[PDB]
Amino acid sequence: LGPEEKDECMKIFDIFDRNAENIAPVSDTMDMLTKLGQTYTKRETEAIMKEARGPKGDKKNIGPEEWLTLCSKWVRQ
């Protein structure tokens, strides 16, 4: 939270990346943006939560960088 939302978002990038997995899917973004904090705006961070997966969605998880860069984009810009 604050400027250290960067620490929090790489911290989820540690819990949901497991330890060495580096791929978090949409379901992980649900448990996240509910548990990791609580919620962000409402419909626009819904944009966060719905865009993480992808177009086909068979095995589209967001790995090393999208989850923090998206978290920095949505939080700080």
UniProtKB/Swiss-Prot annotation:
One term under GO cellular component: myosin II complex
Keywords annotated in UniProt: Acetylation, Calcium, Cytoplasm, Metal-binding, Methylation, Muscle protein, Repeat
Molecular function terms, GO-annotated: calcium ion binding
Domain EF-hand: 4-39, 41-76
Subcellular location: Cytoplasm
Function of the protein: The exact function of this protein is not yet known. It interacts with CAVPT, a protein also of unknown function, in a calcium-dependent way. This protein binds two calcium ions.
Protein name: Calcium vector protein
Parent-record interval covered: 9 to 85 of 162
